[PDB]
Structure 1
């Protein structure tokens, strides 16, 4: 089995980056206000990424 030739990635690197972005000032307040009249909305974070 040639599995020892495989690389080493970081599975949740992208998700952890979004977690760190969510800790910035006003990010949670932005999400809370966006989810006021609906259960599902698109929010643009401080780093320019739009996340459902």
Structure 2
């Protein structure tokens, strides 16, 4: 699965960045979901005030 020396170690390091960047965007998504349930419930309230 390997043969050197066209970057052995450096290819695994970018494979690590992709798992942090892949998990990073998941938290970002989950924020946009909370902010989305919040704006959903605020809208609901702005209606009961009308």
> Whole-Å Cα distance in 1 between the matches of residues 5 and 33 of structure 2?
16
Distance in 2 (alpha carbons) for counterparts of 1:37 and 1:23: 22
Partner deviation per Cα, 1:1-52 (whole Å, 9 max, x = no partner)? xxxxxxxxxx9999999999997230100100011132599999999999xx
Using CA pairs below 8 Å that are at least 6 residues apart, which structure has the higher relative contact order?
A: 1
TM-score where L is the length of structure 1: 0.26
CA gap 1:47/1:39 in 2 versus in 1, 3 angstroms: closer
Q: 1:26 and 1:44, CA in 2 relative to 1: closer, same or farther beyond 3 A?
A: farther
Looking at secondary structure, tell me which structure has more strand per residue. 1
Could you list the runs of 5+ residues in structure 1 that have no partner in the other structure?
A: 1-10
Give the match for residue 31 of structure 2.
41
Runs (4 or more) in structure 1 with deviation over 2 Å come to: 11-23, 39-50
Q: C-alpha root-mean-square deviation of aligned residues, in Å? A: 14.0
